[PDB]
From a paper:
We observed that this depends on the nature of the substituent at pseudo 2-position of the inositol ring. Thus, an axial OH in this position, (InsP3 and compound 4-s), forces the ligand to fit in the InsP3-site. All InsP3 (or InsP4) isomers (compounds 1–4) retain the ability to stabilize the enzyme significantly. Finally, the presence of two axial -OH groups (4-s) constitutes the least stabilizing isomers in this group.
Author numbering: 183 to 192, 196 to 461
The structure:
Amino acid sequence: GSHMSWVQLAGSFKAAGTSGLILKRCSEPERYCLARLMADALRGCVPAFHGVVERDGESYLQLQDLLDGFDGPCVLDCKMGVRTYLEEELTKARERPKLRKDMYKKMLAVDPEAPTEEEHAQRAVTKPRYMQWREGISSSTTLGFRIEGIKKADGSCSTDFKTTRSREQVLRVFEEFVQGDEEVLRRYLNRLQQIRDTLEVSEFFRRHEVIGSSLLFVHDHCHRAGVWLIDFGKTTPLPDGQILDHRRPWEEGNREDGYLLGLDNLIGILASLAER
Ligand SMILES: Nc1ncnc2c1ncn2[C@@H]1O[C@H](COP(=O)(O)OP(=O)(O)OP(=O)(O)O)[C@@H](O)[C@H]1O
Ligand SMILES: O=P(O)(O)O[C@@H]1[C@H](O)[C@@H](O)[C@@H](OP(=O)(O)O)[C@H](OP(=O)(O)O)[C@H]1O
Ligand SMILES: [Mn+2]
């Protein structure tokens, strides 16, 4: 039905006036991206963007609610890329680090030996360091994506995936998510194949570094299934008509995100699951 229904039953999102719409807090990178995307090959692969509206003296993107077509939708959010932070974050952590004490606590929680003697003494870490560690204990570094969360229309949710890393561990999460619905799985794979084809010819995609974006998988008990790209908050245009291949390894300076390495691996896992 609607994402705000799930928010209620379960805060960067707000109920929209119009049926089948949702409001997301406006950010300049994301607004720029969605405007370009409505004119791009990737138009059909992203939520419809209708413009910006003011609500309580605040800027919101008016988006298609992707859950609107579904009867009690199941949702899985997959963070795409081998890298999950911008290169400019490495620069700022070198010249002027913002010691994040929150990121220290989670890291200790998951691995006590993970922080350095100095990080322990600071009780704090830089964002890039926290983000790189998260990439290595999840599937991000090796497969180029990670499962972030599953939501169900009752209000039910799990984000308990920070150590889901192996190909088989990831397959077992998708196995449990689709619950033996062969039609949903087939529809997911058909949609991902058609998304890969669109990305490989997209003018937007070859000209932009896509960091921190997700693939949202949505299905219901009527076997309806959809996948969309979301979250263009960290998607930045390359300078002077430079382009990325989105498969080759990331080395500081080359701005590569491994986005299609992730999608290739994600398609392979779903095709493997379909043959079980
Ligand atoms: N257009 C949409 N329609 C329906 N649900 C959506 C839509 N966009 C986002 N969502 C829901 O909101 C969640 C968060 O989306 P998104 O990543 O864009 O926001 P964010 O505030 O940047 O979050 P994060 O910091 O986790 O990346 C999605 O995983 C999904 O459950
Ligand atoms: O999921 P987590 O392990 O909790 O980490 C969070 C997650 O990677 C994203 O939500 C990041 O936002 P993004 O950099 O805009 O994508 C958060 O970044 P901050 O807003 O905290 O700086 C980070 O905290
Ligand atoms: Mn985000």
